[PDB]
Amino acid sequence: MERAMEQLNRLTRSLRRARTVELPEDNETAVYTLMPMVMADQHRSVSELLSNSKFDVNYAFGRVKRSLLHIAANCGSVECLVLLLKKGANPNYQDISGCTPLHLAARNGQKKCMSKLLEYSADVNICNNEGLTAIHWLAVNGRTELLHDLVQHVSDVDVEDAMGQTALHVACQNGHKTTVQCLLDSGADINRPNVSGATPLYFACSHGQRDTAQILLLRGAKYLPDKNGVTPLDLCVQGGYGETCEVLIQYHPRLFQTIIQMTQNEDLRENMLRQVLEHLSQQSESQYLKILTSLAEVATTNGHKLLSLSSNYDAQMKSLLRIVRMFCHVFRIGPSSPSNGIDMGYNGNKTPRSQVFKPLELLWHSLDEWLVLIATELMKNKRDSQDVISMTANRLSAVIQAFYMCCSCQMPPGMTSPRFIEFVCKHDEVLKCFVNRNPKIIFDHFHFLLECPELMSRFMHIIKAQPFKDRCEWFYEHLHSGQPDSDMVHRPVNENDILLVHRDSIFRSSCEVVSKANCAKLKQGIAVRFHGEEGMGQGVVREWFDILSNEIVNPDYALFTQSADGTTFQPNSNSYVNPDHLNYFRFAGQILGLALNHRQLVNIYFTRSFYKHILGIPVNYQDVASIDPEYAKNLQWILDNDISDLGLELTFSVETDVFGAMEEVPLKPGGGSILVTQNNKAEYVQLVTELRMTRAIQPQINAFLQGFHMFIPPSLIQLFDEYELELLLSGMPEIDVSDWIKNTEYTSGYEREDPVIQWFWEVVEDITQEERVLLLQFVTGSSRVPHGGFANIMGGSGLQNFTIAAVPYTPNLLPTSSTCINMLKLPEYPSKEILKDRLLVALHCGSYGY
């Protein structure tokens, strides 16, 4: 058979060293003298031949200071151990490690070996130098049935290890149940404390173990704390261990309520309790409602106490909100059936809303009363006015946030609560006193209320009379201190996402590289690199933007063209000729947010119209001057003379090239047959402006916004106008006043030093920086200069100069501008008081309408 080699050569090695020889005088050879023979099952014959000998095993061999008796416990034979025990070989003799032969047979499971040592009265209590013993060694090793056969021979089981831990305390820490099954049968103590008071119970919950804690309760363990007071319960929380907590509750239902009281404990990890409750909510519906209803009684308590003027603000204020993010989170998970998964809570299925929101309503009735005060206050105090607005308005704004957080749970994604709406209009006169009191509360408490887009759409009540010098700080303050739509605050960190740039053609190459790379991966110092060239750590970056700036307007690509003013750029309507047409546009919009979000500027300026579309704003008829003034004039004739005197009627459906034939298409959808009624030409002026650009462009423009919106929240930059926006991109320009004085050209009636003009510039010197800059746009659109300055005016109608002309009339009329000529136009203001009254007043309303 296969193991016959072992059968034969067990007899052979007897012959090969048959003649007897005494063991070595040295410690190195004795292990060499017998170790193969013991393994080779000579254990009986060696016990026969070494019955006559003169050496002892305890003269330990080699560096390790072990014995063959340790090997005797290893290799698993007794008949040699018969003779070894006749010699009196001390089992409790130890290595340098302090270990025994027993631990080997324990480690190896040689049962009969473990027996005979105790027949020699082995001191089991001798721990090694590490402080661990056999019984400890086995429970961890999960070897129980021997431990039944072992522990029976001793009564000192309670005797601890070096540190005080019993094997029972160990097994619970490891979850070795059947081990524990035997130890208790063998007379183990249950509530035996460690030095710290740690029962085996405390150890199990630390480990997150279920089934053993079930058992200790059956056999009648006790729920106790440690020395410092920490319970088993606080562990499973800190562990996130849900199912173990469920077991305790079957035997101590008082604990459920204790959980709920933990949520107002600041020290805990909110992202652990979600594991617990979200688990128990799924456990059963009869538990489910008890949870939500139980949460609210804490909320209703804290709120009335929050409104109490004695309570400290910041403490309770999180303690409330620390609850509701779950309470919202649970309802969107919805009612889960008894011992079964989720149910929706649809109509007819018990109306969860009928009960759970009920305890709260006192909070909202309580709420409205204070606001009713303030209305009577503000209305009746307006002539004779610490003020409660100054004192406690910070508090209420905590609660109003609670009223959007709750109501938006019982509506679908992205859909507004109607009940919230009516609440706003009732008190709209009051809320405006808070925003003017503190504008940037809008970022913290009223965040979603006024920056969720469809609400921002609806809640323009406030966004206008939102003060505007607020914006003046906020070109930069809410860029540098962030723009908190949850993400313009901190960045991720990314290193190994390097871009290989193709210097020879960056545009087409980088089109690919970006569309691969992911979004948040690029909100950091971008790893700009070329093919096989380091160049610079990051200073190379600026080449990438600055160069792409001129390559988008690379006219051979046919993306953009100049205005009639020759200075500003706009998208080419006939760009449809391209084979690949739209995909390039998407590349652009991805750029600008990165120039923005990393707050480095760009040198290009576009036409004023193109900004109005980005902000979703409508166009006016002046915006046609970029493409062709003649239509703008032709549209002006319509306003110059009403249709009452008109003989040539217009059609509301006109031949137009849209990258096709001169197709006559309706100006209004379907109503292409009507004509210019006296009450209808306003729309005719309107749609010719819109649908000349829109219909030709709208497939193009949108791809730009998909990427520009990718890295930017649209809800924020509705903040800015169209005249504040171009400055974040190309920087606040420089203005030499003298250079602007010298290049003037006075004409059409005015002389260069009449009283009015001397008094004009007197007003300008009083003006700020962000208003003179808007004057320039009002007459040139363009907002910034070339190198040579105003002496090197780009002009556009040629490189012509900042010019002025007259339109004489009494001060009733206001200024006007002609852009392409880069000329200003002024009705006369015949006095310095007229100037000091009308001009100072006329410029502002003239320089911008609200």
Numbering used by the authors: 1 to 385, 442 to 906
The article reads:
HACE1 (HECT domain and Ankyrin repeat (AKR) containing E3 Ubiquitin Protein Ligase 1) is an AKR‐containing HECT E3 ligase in the “Other” subfamily. HACE1 is composed of an AKR domain at its N‐terminus (aa 26–252), a MID domain (aa 253–522) in the middle of the protein, and a HECT domain at its C‐terminus (aa 523–909). HACE1 is a tumor suppressor E3 ligase that has been reported to inhibit breast cancer cell proliferation through 26S proteasome‐mediated degradation of RAC1. Here, we report the cryo‐EM structures of monomeric and dimeric HACE1 along with in vitro biochemical assays.
